[PDB]
Design a binder for this molecule. Structure first.
Ligand code: NDP
Length: 281
């Protein structure tokens, strides 16, 4: 038996499970499509109800994978997509959202993010997001790859206080946000979505992670996700094209990391002692 996945609250009061699902690199190989769809469906069945995608991912292909996975069960998914900054003018953002809705085969996305900071005024992107919300095409908007200075600029734009999430790189190998951005977002009540929670697989070769996983009869990936489960105000979004790995990732939530485990992880993956440049992928 599994314990329920912990939930994370958005500023609007909506709650989502702390473990979701990613889709970057899905939709590239026709031989993998069926299993990518099955992976997302399996995750939905197991309570990993947030699914993260973007217009960038295969230029609509990953969105179409998500659209297939949610057929006949839209209400059970919390769908996140994104607008590229090169499209984030007011008219551009509306057009991007319409393309995303068509690829996803849905009326409304749950959360719509600015993918990173670009050249169009933030006030204009936010105005588009608010228009889309009033139109019933998105339920909430947020940002991604926003450092502390980028977050500060939201207070200078109308409706900037409505930001629902900041999706940034966060995993055991990439802990920089702990010094500043993560405490700020927690204090604002803005969830951090931890992208690349396995560091795209790179973290899984770490000696200490392998050591701790062995002690729990678990995998390194499960320990990496279990670490993020201990971080309040964080939603992790691991990606896998394998339904077997979707099941494994769900089971990461059953790991009980000890006080000693957490101290050991901090020795091997040192938290930041000073402000550091936001790491991105
Ligand atoms: N906002 C942004 O700028 C960004 C957003 N993202 C989002 O975050 C999501 C997750 O990050 P992502 O970059 O995909 O990388 P992840 O850290 O989620 O790692 C994905 C890799 O790990 C493998 N994998 C998954 N589960 C396991 C497991 N249990 N054991 C071993 N290997 C495993 C996958 O292989 P396989 O699929 O073959 O199983 C894949 O190669 C993205 O898919 C995207 O939705 C990511 C980067 C940037």
């Amino acid at each position: 038996m599994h314990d329920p996945i912990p939930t994370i609250a958005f500023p609007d009061g909506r709650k989502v499970p702390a473990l979701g699902q990613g889709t970057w690199r899905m939709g590239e190989n026709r031989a993998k499509t069926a299993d990518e769809v099955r992976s997302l469906q399996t995750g939905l069945d197991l309570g990993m109800t947030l699914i993260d995608t973007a217009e960038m991912y295969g230029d609509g292909a990953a969105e179409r994978i998500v659209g297939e996975a949610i057929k006949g069960r839209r209400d059970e998914a919390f769908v996140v997509s994104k607008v590229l900054p090169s499209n984030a003018s007011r008219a551009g953002t509306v057009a991007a959202c319409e393309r995303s809705l068509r690829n996803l085969g849905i009326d409304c996305v749950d959360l719509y993010l600015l993918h990173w900071r670009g050249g169009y005024p933030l006030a204009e992107t936010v105005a588009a997001f608010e228009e889309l919300k009033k139109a019933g095409k998105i339920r909430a908007w947020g940002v991604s790859n926003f450092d502390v200075d980028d977050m500060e600029e939201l207070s200078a734009v109308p409706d900037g206080g409505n930001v629902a999430a900041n999706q940034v790189l966060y995993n055991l190998a990439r802990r920089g946000i702990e010094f500043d951005l993560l405490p700020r977002c927690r204090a604002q009540g803005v969830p951090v979505m931890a992208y690349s929670p396995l560091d795209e697989g790179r973290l899984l070769h770490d000696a200490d992670l392998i050591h701790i996983a062995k002690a729990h009869q678990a995998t390194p990936a499960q320990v990496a996700l279990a670490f993020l489960k201990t971080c309040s105000g964080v939603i992790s979004i691991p990606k896998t094209g394998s339904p077997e790995r979707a099941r494994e990732n769900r089971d990461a939530m059953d790991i009980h990391l000890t006080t000693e485990n957490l101290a050991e992880l901090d020795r091997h993956f040192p938290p930041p002692r000073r402000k550091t440049r936001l790491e991105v992928i």
